[PDB]
């Protein structure tokens, strides 16, 4: 899909779910519902190159408004992993979430090499 990496975050959601949720998710109902609800805020029909840090500042405010502060941190938590995969794919050069405090909490380890 797309020419090579010029797809939207809405399409990236399919990729992200199939890649990052195939690694370590443990809670499918949580991660899946996140995707359609808040992970695609409004700029879903927009690309990853367009989501500058200030957009994250806006969506963090939006998610607290349209939802709760709890999920705001939840979404941001997944976004980090998303940007990480985006950068290793070289869709973007930076971590738009780095304009804020992304904390840590969530990584896990290896065993040899994830086969898929």
mmCIF file of N, CA and C in Angstrom:
data_model
loop_
_atom_site.group_PDB
_atom_site.id
_atom_site.type_symbol
_atom_site.label_atom_id
_atom_site.label_comp_id
_atom_site.label_asym_id
_atom_site.label_seq_id
_atom_site.Cartn_x
_atom_site.Cartn_y
_atom_site.Cartn_z
ATOM 1 N N UNK A 1 0.849 -1.212 0.000
ATOM 2 C CA UNK A 1 0.000 0.000 0.000
ATOM 3 C C UNK A 1 0.871 1.244 0.000
ATOM 4 N N UNK A 2 0.371 2.301 -0.640
ATOM 5 C CA UNK A 2 1.129 3.530 -0.863
ATOM 6 C C UNK A 2 2.291 3.280 -1.821
ATOM 7 N N UNK A 3 2.941 4.351 -2.249
ATOM 8 C CA UNK A 3 4.078 4.244 -3.153
ATOM 9 C C UNK A 3 5.221 3.482 -2.486
ATOM 10 N N UNK A 4 5.614 3.932 -1.298
ATOM 11 C CA UNK A 4 6.636 3.237 -0.520
ATOM 12 C C UNK A 4 6.467 3.499 0.978
ATOM 13 N N UNK A 5 6.262 4.758 1.353
ATOM 14 C CA UNK A 5 6.082 5.112 2.764
ATOM 15 C C UNK A 5 5.185 6.336 2.917
ATOM 16 N N UNK A 6 4.469 6.670 1.856
ATOM 17 C CA UNK A 6 3.667 7.886 1.829
ATOM 18 C C UNK A 6 2.207 7.599 2.164
ATOM 19 N N UNK A 7 1.979 6.719 3.125
ATOM 20 C CA UNK A 7 0.622 6.385 3.530
ATOM 21 C C UNK A 7 0.221 7.165 4.778
ATOM 22 N N UNK A 8 -1.057 7.110 5.107
ATOM 23 C CA UNK A 8 -1.598 7.867 6.222
ATOM 24 C C UNK A 8 -1.499 7.075 7.522
ATOM 25 N N UNK A 9 -1.662 7.760 8.650
ATOM 26 C CA UNK A 9 -1.590 7.110 9.953
ATOM 27 C C UNK A 9 -2.774 6.155 10.145
ATOM 28 N N UNK A 10 -3.871 6.419 9.435
ATOM 29 C CA UNK A 10 -5.025 5.528 9.458
ATOM 30 C C UNK A 10 -4.664 4.176 8.854
ATOM 31 N N UNK A 11 -3.860 4.202 7.797
ATOM 32 C CA UNK A 11 -3.386 2.978 7.170
ATOM 33 C C UNK A 11 -2.263 2.389 8.017
ATOM 34 N N UNK A 12 -1.434 3.271 8.570
ATOM 35 C CA UNK A 12 -0.354 2.873 9.466
ATOM 36 C C UNK A 12 -0.897 2.092 10.659
ATOM 37 N N UNK A 13 -2.122 2.404 11.065
ATOM 38 C CA UNK A 13 -2.778 1.698 12.162
ATOM 39 C C UNK A 13 -2.875 0.200 11.878
ATOM 40 N N UNK A 14 -3.132 -0.151 10.620
ATOM 41 C CA UNK A 14 -3.201 -1.553 10.208
ATOM 42 C C UNK A 14 -1.831 -2.206 10.355
ATOM 43 N N UNK A 15 -0.817 -1.500 9.868
ATOM 44 C CA UNK A 15 0.571 -1.933 9.977
ATOM 45 C C UNK A 15 0.984 -2.064 11.444
ATOM 46 N N UNK A 16 0.727 -1.008 12.208
ATOM 47 C CA UNK A 16 1.104 -0.941 13.614
ATOM 48 C C UNK A 16 0.497 -2.093 14.407
ATOM 49 N N UNK A 17 -0.789 -2.345 14.199
ATOM 50 C CA UNK A 17 -1.480 -3.411 14.913
ATOM 51 C C UNK A 17 -0.877 -4.769 14.558
ATOM 52 N N UNK A 18 -0.598 -4.969 13.280
ATOM 53 C CA UNK A 18 -0.075 -6.240 12.802
ATOM 54 C C UNK A 18 1.389 -6.431 13.207
ATOM 55 N N UNK A 19 2.093 -5.343 13.478
ATOM 56 C CA UNK A 19 3.510 -5.440 13.809
ATOM 57 C C UNK A 19 3.769 -5.330 15.309
ATOM 58 N N UNK A 20 3.276 -4.272 15.938
ATOM 59 C CA UNK A 20 3.616 -4.000 17.332
ATOM 60 C C UNK A 20 2.747 -4.820 18.281
ATOM 61 N N UNK A 21 1.540 -5.140 17.843
ATOM 62 C CA UNK A 21 0.635 -5.955 18.640
ATOM 63 C C UNK A 21 0.972 -7.435 18.449
ATOM 64 N N UNK A 22 1.720 -7.736 17.395
ATOM 65 C CA UNK A 22 2.180 -9.099 17.159
ATOM 66 C C UNK A 22 3.435 -9.392 17.977
ATOM 67 N N UNK A 23 3.960 -8.360 18.627
ATOM 68 C CA UNK A 23 5.152 -8.519 19.433
ATOM 69 C C UNK A 23 4.830 -8.776 20.891
ATOM 70 N N UNK A 24 4.238 -7.788 21.550
ATOM 71 C CA UNK A 24 3.878 -7.913 22.951
ATOM 72 C C UNK A 24 2.682 -7.021 23.250
ATOM 73 N N UNK A 25 1.521 -7.637 23.402
ATOM 74 C CA UNK A 25 0.293 -6.895 23.635
ATOM 75 C C UNK A 25 -0.426 -7.409 24.887
ATOM 76 N N UNK A 26 -0.565 -8.737 24.978
ATOM 77 C CA UNK A 26 -1.152 -9.443 26.127
ATOM 78 C C UNK A 26 -2.621 -9.065 26.422
ATOM 79 N N UNK A 27 -3.083 -7.931 25.915
ATOM 80 C CA UNK A 27 -4.443 -7.457 26.164
ATOM 81 C C UNK A 27 -5.041 -6.941 24.866
ATOM 82 N N UNK A 28 -5.607 -7.854 24.077
ATOM 83 C CA UNK A 28 -6.090 -7.562 22.723
ATOM 84 C C UNK A 28 -7.253 -6.577 22.702
ATOM 85 N N UNK A 29 -8.199 -6.751 23.619
ATOM 86 C CA UNK A 29 -9.395 -5.912 23.649
ATOM 87 C C UNK A 29 -9.034 -4.455 23.923
ATOM 88 N N UNK A 30 -8.001 -4.249 24.731
ATOM 89 C CA UNK A 30 -7.547 -2.907 25.063
ATOM 90 C C UNK A 30 -6.867 -2.250 23.865
ATOM 91 N N UNK A 31 -5.870 -2.927 23.311
ATOM 92 C CA UNK A 31 -5.081 -2.358 22.227
ATOM 93 C C UNK A 31 -5.908 -2.164 20.956
ATOM 94 N N UNK A 32 -6.864 -3.054 20.714
ATOM 95 C CA UNK A 32 -7.666 -2.985 19.499
ATOM 96 C C UNK A 32 -8.627 -1.796 19.552
ATOM 97 N N UNK A 33 -9.312 -1.636 20.679
ATOM 98 C CA UNK A 33 -10.289 -0.565 20.830
ATOM 99 C C UNK A 33 -9.609 0.802 20.829
ATOM 100 N N UNK A 34 -8.388 0.848 21.361
ATOM 101 C CA UNK A 34 -7.585 2.068 21.360
ATOM 102 C C UNK A 34 -7.415 2.602 19.943
ATOM 103 N N UNK A 35 -7.121 1.688 19.018
ATOM 104 C CA UNK A 35 -6.820 2.041 17.634
ATOM 105 C C UNK A 35 -7.932 2.875 17.007
ATOM 106 N N UNK A 36 -9.150 2.354 17.031
ATOM 107 C CA UNK A 36 -10.263 2.992 16.340
ATOM 108 C C UNK A 36 -10.789 4.204 17.106
ATOM 109 N N UNK A 37 -10.564 4.237 18.413
ATOM 110 C CA UNK A 37 -11.143 5.287 19.239
ATOM 111 C C UNK A 37 -10.279 6.542 19.289
ATOM 112 N N UNK A 38 -9.054 6.413 19.775
ATOM 113 C CA UNK A 38 -8.229 7.593 20.014
ATOM 114 C C UNK A 38 -6.960 7.608 19.164
ATOM 115 N N UNK A 39 -6.405 6.426 18.869
ATOM 116 C CA UNK A 39 -5.181 6.326 18.062
ATOM 117 C C UNK A 39 -5.338 7.071 16.735
ATOM 118 N N UNK A 40 -6.536 7.005 16.174
ATOM 119 C CA UNK A 40 -6.886 7.806 15.008
ATOM 120 C C UNK A 40 -7.782 8.972 15.447
ATOM 121 N N UNK A 41 -7.171 10.089 15.891
ATOM 122 C CA UNK A 41 -7.895 11.201 16.513
ATOM 123 C C UNK A 41 -8.716 12.002 15.514
ATOM 124 N N UNK A 42 -8.051 12.491 14.477
ATOM 125 C CA UNK A 42 -8.695 13.293 13.443
ATOM 126 C C UNK A 42 -7.772 13.421 12.248
ATOM 127 N N UNK A 43 -6.482 13.446 12.537
ATOM 128 C CA UNK A 43 -5.454 13.481 11.508
ATOM 129 C C UNK A 43 -5.190 12.086 10.941
ATOM 130 N N UNK A 44 -6.178 11.200 11.040
ATOM 131 C CA UNK A 44 -6.022 9.848 10.537
ATOM 132 C C UNK A 44 -5.878 9.832 9.031
ATOM 133 N N UNK A 45 -6.598 10.732 8.376
ATOM 134 C CA UNK A 45 -6.537 10.868 6.929
ATOM 135 C C UNK A 45 -5.338 11.735 6.522
ATOM 136 N N UNK A 46 -4.379 11.850 7.430
ATOM 137 C CA UNK A 46 -3.166 12.615 7.196
ATOM 138 C C UNK A 46 -1.957 11.690 7.341
ATOM 139 N N UNK A 47 -0.814 12.093 6.801
ATOM 140 C CA UNK A 47 0.368 11.242 6.824
ATOM 141 C C UNK A 47 1.143 11.398 8.121
ATOM 142 N N UNK A 48 2.192 10.602 8.243
ATOM 143 C CA UNK A 48 3.024 10.598 9.438
ATOM 144 C C UNK A 48 4.019 11.753 9.390
ATOM 145 N N UNK A 49 4.320 12.200 8.178
ATOM 146 C CA UNK A 49 5.259 13.296 7.966
ATOM 147 C C UNK A 49 4.668 14.621 8.439
ATOM 148 N N UNK A 50 3.350 14.650 8.575
ATOM 149 C CA UNK A 50 2.634 15.885 8.861
ATOM 150 C C UNK A 50 2.371 16.060 10.351
ATOM 151 N N UNK A 51 2.473 14.983 11.117
ATOM 152 C CA UNK A 51 2.180 15.055 12.539
ATOM 153 C C UNK A 51 3.401 15.537 13.331
ATOM 154 N N UNK A 52 3.553 16.851 13.386
ATOM 155 C CA UNK A 52 4.601 17.467 14.182
ATOM 156 C C UNK A 52 4.193 17.488 15.657
ATOM 157 N N UNK A 53 5.175 17.603 16.574
ATOM 158 C CA UNK A 53 4.946 17.590 18.030
ATOM 159 C C UNK A 53 3.746 18.425 18.489
ATOM 160 N N UNK A 54 3.552 19.589 17.876
ATOM 161 C CA UNK A 54 2.446 20.472 18.244
ATOM 162 C C UNK A 54 1.086 19.813 18.034
ATOM 163 N N UNK A 55 1.013 18.875 17.104
ATOM 164 C CA UNK A 55 -0.223 18.130 16.881
ATOM 165 C C UNK A 55 -0.491 17.212 18.062
ATOM 166 N N UNK A 56 0.577 16.656 18.623
ATOM 167 C CA UNK A 56 0.466 15.797 19.792
ATOM 168 C C UNK A 56 -0.027 16.613 20.984
ATOM 169 N N UNK A 57 0.458 17.845 21.081
ATOM 170 C CA UNK A 57 0.033 18.767 22.131
ATOM 171 C C UNK A 57 -1.459 19.047 22.015
ATOM 172 N N UNK A 58 -1.930 19.133 20.779
ATOM 173 C CA UNK A 58 -3.334 19.408 20.508
ATOM 174 C C UNK A 58 -4.198 18.180 20.787
ATOM 175 N N UNK A 59 -3.742 17.009 20.350
ATOM 176 C CA UNK A 59 -4.515 15.784 20.540
ATOM 177 C C UNK A 59 -4.553 15.367 22.010
ATOM 178 N N UNK A 60 -3.472 15.620 22.748
ATOM 179 C CA UNK A 60 -3.439 15.315 24.179
ATOM 180 C C UNK A 60 -4.487 16.133 24.921
ATOM 181 N N UNK A 61 -4.680 17.364 24.477
ATOM 182 C CA UNK A 61 -5.708 18.224 25.012
ATOM 183 C C UNK A 61 -7.086 17.723 24.581
ATOM 184 N N UNK A 62 -7.169 17.291 23.326
ATOM 185 C CA UNK A 62 -8.418 16.810 22.748
ATOM 186 C C UNK A 62 -8.900 15.527 23.421
ATOM 187 N N UNK A 63 -7.989 14.579 23.633
ATOM 188 C CA UNK A 63 -8.343 13.293 24.238
ATOM 189 C C UNK A 63 -8.797 13.464 25.688
ATOM 190 N N UNK A 64 -8.218 14.430 26.392
ATOM 191 C CA UNK A 64 -8.643 14.724 27.756
ATOM 192 C C UNK A 64 -10.034 15.347 27.745
ATOM 193 N N UNK A 65 -10.310 16.124 26.706
ATOM 194 C CA UNK A 65 -11.584 16.791 26.553
ATOM 195 C C UNK A 65 -12.672 15.797 26.142
ATOM 196 N N UNK A 66 -12.393 15.012 25.108
ATOM 197 C CA UNK A 66 -13.390 14.098 24.551
ATOM 198 C C UNK A 66 -13.420 12.769 25.302
ATOM 199 N N UNK A 67 -12.448 12.561 26.172
ATOM 200 C CA UNK A 67 -12.382 11.326 26.924
ATOM 201 C C UNK A 67 -11.965 11.546 28.361
ATOM 202 N N UNK A 68 -10.714 11.233 28.663
ATOM 203 C CA UNK A 68 -10.204 11.320 30.022
ATOM 204 C C UNK A 68 -8.684 11.451 30.014
ATOM 205 N N UNK A 69 -8.092 11.985 31.093
ATOM 206 C CA UNK A 69 -6.637 12.126 31.203
ATOM 207 C C UNK A 69 -5.932 10.772 31.256
ATOM 208 N N UNK A 70 -6.649 9.760 31.731
ATOM 209 C CA UNK A 70 -6.103 8.417 31.849
ATOM 210 C C UNK A 70 -5.717 7.865 30.476
ATOM 211 N N UNK A 71 -6.663 7.902 29.541
ATOM 212 C CA UNK A 71 -6.437 7.379 28.200
ATOM 213 C C UNK A 71 -5.446 8.244 27.427
ATOM 214 N N UNK A 72 -5.372 9.525 27.779
ATOM 215 C CA UNK A 72 -4.412 10.439 27.165
ATOM 216 C C UNK A 72 -2.986 9.901 27.282
ATOM 217 N N UNK A 73 -2.639 9.413 28.468
ATOM 218 C CA UNK A 73 -1.322 8.825 28.701
ATOM 219 C C UNK A 73 -1.220 7.481 27.998
ATOM 220 N N UNK A 74 -2.340 6.771 27.969
ATOM 221 C CA UNK A 74 -2.415 5.455 27.339
ATOM 222 C C UNK A 74 -2.071 5.553 25.853
ATOM 223 N N UNK A 75 -2.747 6.463 25.152
ATOM 224 C CA UNK A 75 -2.511 6.681 23.729
ATOM 225 C C UNK A 75 -1.065 7.099 23.466
ATOM 226 N N UNK A 76 -0.588 8.075 24.238
ATOM 227 C CA UNK A 76 0.778 8.578 24.103
ATOM 228 C C UNK A 76 1.788 7.442 24.255
ATOM 229 N N UNK A 77 1.467 6.506 25.137
ATOM 230 C CA UNK A 77 2.315 5.351 25.403
ATOM 231 C C UNK A 77 2.501 4.502 24.141
ATOM 232 N N UNK A 78 1.418 4.303 23.399
ATOM 233 C CA UNK A 78 1.464 3.510 22.174
ATOM 234 C C UNK A 78 2.114 4.294 21.038
ATOM 235 N N UNK A 79 1.927 5.613 21.051
ATOM 236 C CA UNK A 79 2.462 6.485 20.005
ATOM 237 C C UNK A 79 3.982 6.392 19.933
ATOM 238 N N UNK A 80 4.619 6.256 21.089
ATOM 239 C CA UNK A 80 6.075 6.121 21.157
ATOM 240 C C UNK A 80 6.536 4.943 20.310
ATOM 241 N N UNK A 81 5.962 3.781 20.595
ATOM 242 C CA UNK A 81 6.246 2.567 19.831
ATOM 243 C C UNK A 81 5.952 2.767 18.346
ATOM 244 N N UNK A 82 4.883 3.502 18.056
ATOM 245 C CA UNK A 82 4.506 3.804 16.680
ATOM 246 C C UNK A 82 5.599 4.608 15.978
ATOM 247 N N UNK A 83 6.055 5.681 16.621
ATOM 248 C CA UNK A 83 7.104 6.523 16.051
ATOM 249 C C UNK A 83 8.404 5.741 15.911
ATOM 250 N N UNK A 84 8.669 4.870 16.876
ATOM 251 C CA UNK A 84 9.851 4.012 16.837
ATOM 252 C C UNK A 84 9.865 3.161 15.569
ATOM 253 N N UNK A 85 8.719 2.578 15.248
ATOM 254 C CA UNK A 85 8.586 1.749 14.058
ATOM 255 C C UNK A 85 8.618 2.614 12.801
ATOM 256 N N UNK A 86 8.069 3.814 12.905
ATOM 257 C CA UNK A 86 8.075 4.757 11.798
ATOM 258 C C UNK A 86 9.497 5.203 11.465
ATOM 259 N N UNK A 87 10.317 5.395 12.492
ATOM 260 C CA UNK A 87 11.696 5.835 12.301
ATOM 261 C C UNK A 87 12.573 4.712 11.748
ATOM 262 N N UNK A 88 12.352 3.482 12.204
ATOM 263 C CA UNK A 88 13.127 2.348 11.696
ATOM 264 C C UNK A 88 12.714 2.023 10.260
ATOM 265 N N UNK A 89 11.535 2.500 9.873
ATOM 266 C CA UNK A 89 11.070 2.399 8.491
ATOM 267 C C UNK A 89 11.488 3.657 7.727
ATOM 268 N N UNK A 90 12.012 4.613 8.488
ATOM 269 C CA UNK A 90 12.447 5.918 7.991
ATOM 270 C C UNK A 90 11.308 6.669 7.299
ATOM 271 N N UNK A 91 10.132 6.627 7.908
ATOM 272 C CA UNK A 91 9.017 7.450 7.463
ATOM 273 C C UNK A 91 9.228 8.867 7.978
ATOM 274 N N UNK A 92 9.648 8.948 9.233
ATOM 275 C CA UNK A 92 9.982 10.212 9.867
ATOM 276 C C UNK A 92 11.381 10.134 10.464
ATOM 277 N N UNK A 93 11.967 11.287 10.742
ATOM 278 C CA UNK A 93 13.337 11.345 11.234
ATOM 279 C C UNK A 93 13.370 11.585 12.746
ATOM 280 N N UNK A 94 12.254 12.039 13.303
ATOM 281 C CA UNK A 94 12.218 12.411 14.712
ATOM 282 C C UNK A 94 11.038 11.784 15.440
ATOM 283 N N UNK A 95 11.061 11.913 16.759
ATOM 284 C CA UNK A 95 10.003 11.424 17.635
ATOM 285 C C UNK A 95 9.134 12.589 18.099
ATOM 286 N N UNK A 96 8.048 12.907 17.374
ATOM 287 C CA UNK A 96 7.181 14.058 17.689
ATOM 288 C C UNK A 96 6.726 14.103 19.156
ATOM 289 N N UNK A 97 6.771 12.960 19.837
ATOM 290 C CA UNK A 97 6.372 12.883 21.241
ATOM 291 C C UNK A 97 7.490 13.361 22.171
ATOM 292 N N UNK A 98 8.690 13.534 21.622
ATOM 293 C CA UNK A 98 9.855 13.938 22.410
ATOM 294 C C UNK A 98 9.766 15.397 22.848
ATOM 295 N N UNK A 99 8.745 16.097 22.367
ATOM 296 C CA UNK A 99 8.489 17.465 22.798
ATOM 297 C C UNK A 99 7.842 17.461 24.177
ATOM 298 N N UNK A 100 7.468 16.271 24.627
ATOM 299 C CA UNK A 100 6.823 16.092 25.915
ATOM 300 C C UNK A 100 7.563 15.027 26.706
ATOM 301 N N UNK A 101 7.046 14.679 27.872
ATOM 302 C CA UNK A 101 7.646 13.627 28.678
ATOM 303 C C UNK A 101 6.962 12.295 28.381
ATOM 304 N N UNK A 102 7.643 11.394 27.658
ATOM 305 C CA UNK A 102 7.072 10.112 27.248
ATOM 306 C C UNK A 102 7.243 9.016 28.302
ATOM 307 N N UNK A 103 7.973 9.335 29.368
ATOM 308 C CA UNK A 103 8.241 8.372 30.416
ATOM 309 C C UNK A 103 8.901 7.114 29.894
ATOM 310 N N UNK A 104 8.499 5.988 30.451
ATOM 311 C CA UNK A 104 9.009 4.685 30.039
ATOM 312 C C UNK A 104 7.880 3.651 30.136
ATOM 313 N N UNK A 105 8.037 2.667 31.023
ATOM 314 C CA UNK A 105 6.994 1.682 31.330
ATOM 315 C C UNK A 105 6.500 0.928 30.092
ATOM 316 N N UNK A 106 7.218 -0.120 29.717
ATOM 317 C CA UNK A 106 6.774 -0.966 28.628
ATOM 318 C C UNK A 106 7.846 -1.186 27.581
ATOM 319 N N UNK A 107 8.416 -2.384 27.570
ATOM 320 C CA UNK A 107 9.424 -2.726 26.582
ATOM 321 C C UNK A 107 9.595 -4.224 26.424
ATOM 322 N N UNK A 108 9.839 -4.899 27.547
ATOM 323 C CA UNK A 108 10.042 -6.349 27.589
ATOM 324 C C UNK A 108 11.394 -6.738 26.997
ATOM 325 N N UNK A 109 11.642 -8.038 26.891
ATOM 326 C CA UNK A 109 12.949 -8.532 26.475
ATOM 327 C C UNK A 109 12.838 -9.469 25.279
ATOM 328 N N UNK A 110 13.966 -10.056 24.912
ATOM 329 C CA UNK A 110 14.028 -11.010 23.816
ATOM 330 C C UNK A 110 14.309 -12.403 24.354
ATOM 331 N N UNK A 111 14.382 -13.368 23.459
ATOM 332 C CA UNK A 111 14.757 -14.721 23.830
ATOM 333 C C UNK A 111 15.841 -15.225 22.885
ATOM 334 N N UNK A 112 15.854 -14.666 21.681
ATOM 335 C CA UNK A 112 16.841 -15.007 20.662
ATOM 336 C C UNK A 112 16.616 -14.129 19.441
ATOM 337 N N UNK A 113 15.397 -14.187 18.926
ATOM 338 C CA UNK A 113 14.980 -13.390 17.781
ATOM 339 C C UNK A 113 13.518 -13.686 17.477
ATOM 340 N N UNK A 114 12.654 -12.688 17.652
ATOM 341 C CA UNK A 114 11.245 -12.830 17.288
ATOM 342 C C UNK A 114 11.126 -13.291 15.843
ATOM 343 N N UNK A 115 10.540 -14.463 15.657
ATOM 344 C CA UNK A 115 10.490 -15.096 14.348
ATOM 345 C C UNK A 115 9.551 -14.339 13.414
ATOM 346 N N UNK A 116 8.581 -13.648 13.997
ATOM 347 C CA UNK A 116 7.611 -12.878 13.221
ATOM 348 C C UNK A 116 7.042 -11.735 14.058
#
